Design a protein around this ligand. Structure first.
Ligand SMILES: CC(C)CCC[C@@H](C)[C@H]1CC[C@H]2[C@@H]3CC=C4C[C@@H](O)CC[C@]4(C)[C@H]3CC[C@]12C
Ligand SMILES: CC(C)CCC[C@@H](C)[C@H]1CC[C@H]2[C@@H]3CC=C4C[C@@H](O)CC[C@]4(C)[C@H]3CC[C@]12C
Ligand SMILES: CC(C)CCC[C@@H](C)[C@H]1CC[C@H]2[C@@H]3CC=C4C[C@@H](O)CC[C@]4(C)[C@H]3CC[C@]12C
Ligand SMILES: CC(C)CCC[C@@H](C)[C@H]1CC[C@H]2[C@@H]3CC=C4C[C@@H](O)CC[C@]4(C)[C@H]3CC[C@]12C
Ligand SMILES: CC(C)CCC[C@@H](C)[C@H]1CC[C@H]2[C@@H]3CC=C4C[C@@H](O)CC[C@]4(C)[C@H]3CC[C@]12C
Ligand SMILES: CC(C)CCC[C@@H](C)[C@H]1CC[C@H]2[C@@H]3CC=C4C[C@@H](O)CC[C@]4(C)[C@H]3CC[C@]12C
Ligand SMILES: [Mg+2]
Lengths: 96, 145, 163, 132, 96, 145, 48, 48
């Protein structure tokens, strides 16, 4: 959830009005890069969960978290525009 | 409802990606179509007042000639050429240039632009196939939701 | 280096073609390599394989245009002048093919090339059509059958022009 | 040897050394440098005007080479040289040693470009300024 | 193909053909000619032989040097050196 | 003015690169067009004096038949064949070879040369796409200047 | 230069040099037919 | 001028560091170190 939130905040900051400018280009790129890396991390941890116990991983993905007004991690991932998380076999298995 | 299927759905996403290439082809094709149409329409029927029929004549034949249906019999009839050979023995000598302009035009549209569009489609397809699969898995969630 | 002979490598197709068409006006003002000066420059430029290759192309192009004109224009009631010129031209081509047959590395090496086979088809089609016409020159039907055979020749000579 | 030209006589010792380097490189068989200088069709000062003794004993001076390289680059190259800064009267100036270095490196840099020695070219490029 | 072919184009190549036939008739029946024949000295032949053997030796040295600069060869050579290094340490430990 | 746009400008540069391939296609196509046209024109209308109409007949139909508009009804009318089946019951037996020559010709032009042109376009596109982007950035400076 | 300070790099690219009759480095790069320099993001940023 | 020469020096240091971090250079440098290591063992065996 923290990796998805981190990816979303860096992605939104990279296209924000405060980051536009000739000198900020590399910074923007770095933010986007870090966002992608955090997304990869979120996939990796998820993959490990699906490797250990798929049913327990499904229970984890179906769990409602209080921090986003009581709805699950897949909605958070969709809101964060995380294409890599949604394309993972565990997430697709829960959706199926 | 094709998006549920593993074959029709990503191909639909790829088709929506191509639409920009199709629009690009339309923008390139518009130059030859309007230019050849105004020039050809003036050459076929000169000394005529401008009307809505002139505009319809500019737009109608040039667009449908790039798909291989040639109106050469119709253009031959409009040119008032009475010879056994089609663009010979005409009242005006300028209307005999009508097939030549066309000769450049379909060379521009079918030989050059259509094959370029095929090249853009192959390159575009190879670029966005994996992204189309990923986007299809996201649209799978969208349908589920 | 063997291709250009005793000539600079920067020479283009048009320059050599122009020098071929205008021998006394383009050759002294060009750079490459009295009787023994003019003769030496002529023997060096015209001994090069590239100039004879360009001459053979141009010659075959004229052959295609003149033979195409001959097939399109109506046949006369006797053997016309253009027919005699083409007859002399194809004998000369046939003698050149015989020369190629004698001086190559065997009959198999000559017949391996597809262009030599195309040359044989050219000579064979022209002589059949010519003897078909020449058997009865006032016969309309002989002219029609001869032009039918000569359609195939024009097709092979334009195919042979791709060499 | 002493020369009647005032432009050639104001030149320092290291410029004559670069001229000696050009001469030594030029004296090798089938060298493209000699062909370039002969094909250039210029005088001792590099001006496009096409006596003989001065034109042959000092045929590889740096000014003529500057003109040849100048014609190869573009239509408005004109390097402003100041050999007066190599005199002992300008020693008290603070930053003169950098400029003096830069100019020297530049001339040697051009020589290293002419002989197609990439490694020396890169080294003379490093010491000086105006890298891009 | 175009080295041995006569220069003259196709309508006029009959003149070239009868000229070659005339030369053939003068050589076979008349025997009034003796053509042209040029040879090469032994010095330039030995120069070509010496040049070719020197360049052969130069290519073999360059080829050997290039094969020793490959990554696989360097790793293998480094490995054998490390094996001999272990052997020398065994000798050192024996001396200790 | 298309060169400012990030889509239309590099595609225009790629199109100017293809023009050499288009010219190459024209040179290959010229052999079949002139050969088939002279041969076919002689077969359709024999025993006729040479004129400008003969040359127009050589050039007109062969070029426009490679774009799929076949003049087979027009060729059937010119051949003077009165049978229900088109190339049967003709005055001369040689004119029945007119569809056969054509059969080779469009095999040469549409089946062989057009598909080869598609292959050259895909290869050429992959080769010069990055160079077209770089050249577009240089032409961007050219416009600015 | 573009990595360290983009604005200062832009000032460097806009600076007129006496050695090519008082015009900037991008004109020099265009005259030298340097496609790689012109395609760089810093040069493109100055042109934009 | 100062900015450009500093960035030139910075690029050369970064370029030198990048060329020393390549796999081929590291294998070659490692190889020469192992050759010198064998030399030092020969010296050690001489002392033994
Ligand atoms: C570079 C390109 C675009 C220019 C081409 C030249 C054009 C404009 C010129 C060249 C030859 C000209 C033709 C020459 C002869 C005639 C016959 C006359 O009874 C009507 C006009 C007509 C048919 C001319 C029309 C204009 C023409 C086609
Ligand atoms: C413009 C570039 C691409 C090539 C130029 C070719 C143009 C100018 C040529 C090619 C074909 C030509 C036409 C061919 C035949 C005729 C019939 C004649 O009785 C009058 C001129 C006219 C009508 C010509 C006008 C000029 C023409 C259109
Ligand atoms: C390999 C390809 C590109 C060959 C090129 C074909 C060109 C040379 C041919 C194809 C069709 C031809 C045209 C067909 C009909 C006519 C009408 C006539 O009254 C004047 C000539 C004119 C206008 C021809 C000009 C030449 C033409 C345009
Ligand atoms: C190797 C290829 C190119 C050669 C093909 C052979 C050609 C030239 C020969 C083979 C059979 C021949 C045909 C046989 C019979 C007839 C019927 C006659 O009433 C008119 C001529 C016509 C129609 C001949 C025309 C020429 C012909 C088509
Ligand atoms: C040339 C290579 C590719 C194949 C050879 C096939 C040619 C010679 C054949 C194929 C089809 C044939 C034609 C088919 C039908 C007829 C009608 C007949 O009443 C006279 C002969 C004629 C007109 C034939 C002439 C020869 C022909 C053209
Ligand atoms: C797979 C493809 C290539 C099949 C080949 C098609 C060939 C064999 C066919 C297609 C069209 C045919 C022609 C159609 C019409 C006629 C006119 C007739 O009076 C004689 C035969 C002739 C000239 C035919 C010869 C054979 C032909 C050329
Ligand atoms: Mg032959």
């Amino acid at each position: 959830i923290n990796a998805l939130v981190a990816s979303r905040i860096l992605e939104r900051l990279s296209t924000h009005r405060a980051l536009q400018g000739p000198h900020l280009a590399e910074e923007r790129a770095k933010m986007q890069h870090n966002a992608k890396k955090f997304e990869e991390l979120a996939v990796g941890v998820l993959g490990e969960c699906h490797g250990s116990d798929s049913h327990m991983a499904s229970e984890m993905l179906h769990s409602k978290n209080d921090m986003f007004n009581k709805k699950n991690a897949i909605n958070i991932a969709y809101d964060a525009k995380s294409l890599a998380f949604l394309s993972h076999p565990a997430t697709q298995s829960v959706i199926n | 409802y094709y998006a549920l299927s593993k074959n029709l759905g990503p191909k639909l996403i790829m088709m929506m990606e191509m639409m920009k290439d199709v629009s690009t082809f339309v923008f390139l094709l518009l130059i030859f179509l309007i230019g050849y149409g105004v020039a050809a329409q003036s050459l076929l029927s000169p000394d005529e007042d401008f009307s809505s029929r002139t505009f319809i004549g500019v737009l109608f034949r040039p667009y449908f000639q790039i798909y291989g249906e040639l109106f050469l019999d119709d253009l031959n009839s409009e040119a008032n050429c009475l010879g056994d050979t089609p663009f010979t023995e005409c009242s005006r000598e300028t209307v005999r240039m009508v097939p030549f302009f066309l000769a450049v035009y379909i060379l521009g549209s079918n030989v050059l632009l259509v094959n370029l569009l095929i090249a853009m489609f192959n390159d575009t397809y190879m670029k966005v196939q994996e992204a189309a699969e990923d986007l299809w898995r996201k649209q799978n969630y969208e349908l589920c939701a | 280096a063997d291709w250009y002979g005793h000539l600079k490598s920067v020479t283009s197709f048009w320059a050599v073609l122009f020098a071929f068409f205008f021998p006394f006006f383009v050759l002294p003002f060009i750079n490459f390599s009295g009787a023994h000066r003019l003769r030496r420059k002529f023997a060096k430029f015209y001994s090069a394989p590239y100039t004879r290759f360009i001459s053979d192309l141009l010659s075959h192009f004229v052959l295609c245009v003149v033979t195409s004109y001959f097939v399109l224009d109506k046949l006369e009631d006797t053997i016309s002048a253009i027919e005699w010129i083409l007859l002399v031209w194809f004998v000369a081509l046939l003698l050149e093919e015989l020369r190629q047959m004698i001086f190559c590395d065997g009959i198999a090496e000559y017949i391996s090339d597809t262009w030599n086979r195309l040359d044989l088809i050219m000579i064979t089609l022209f002589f059949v059509g010519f003897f078909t016409h020449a058997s009865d020159p006032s016969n309309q039907d002989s002219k029609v059958v001869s032009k039918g055979i000569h359609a195939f020749l024009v097709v092979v000579l334009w195919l042979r022009f791709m060499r | 040897a002493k020369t009647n030209i005032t432009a050639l006589d104001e030149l320092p010792s290291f410029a004559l050394a670069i001229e000696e380097l050009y001469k030594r490189e030029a004296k090798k068989p089938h060298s493209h440098v000699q062909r370039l200088v002969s094909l250039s069709n210029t005088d001792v000062l590099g001006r496009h005007y096409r006596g003989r003794d001065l034109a042959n004993t000092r045929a590889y001076n740096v000014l003529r080479m500057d003109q040849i390289f100048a014609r190869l680059v573009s239509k408005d190259f004109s390097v402003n040289r100041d050999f007066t800064i190599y005199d002992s009267k300008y020693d008290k100036v603070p930053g003169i040693q950098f400029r003096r270095t830069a100019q020297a490196s530049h001339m040697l840099f051009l020589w290293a470009i002419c002989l197609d020695r990439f490694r020396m070219a890169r080294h003379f490029w490093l010491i000086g300024d105006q890298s891009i | 193909e175009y080295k041995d072919r006569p220069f003259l184009p196709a309508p006029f190549i009959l003149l070239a053909h009868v000229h070659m036939l005339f030369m053939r008739l003068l050589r076979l029946c008349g025997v009034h000619t003796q053509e042209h024949e040029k040879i090469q000295d032994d010095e330039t032949k030995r120069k070509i032989t010496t040049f070719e053997a020197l360049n052969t030796d130069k290519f073999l040295r360059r080829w050997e040097r290039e094969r020793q600069e490959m990554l696989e060869a360097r790793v293998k050579m480094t490995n054998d050196n490390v094996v001999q290094a272990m052997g020398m340490m065994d000798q050192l430990l024996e001396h200790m």
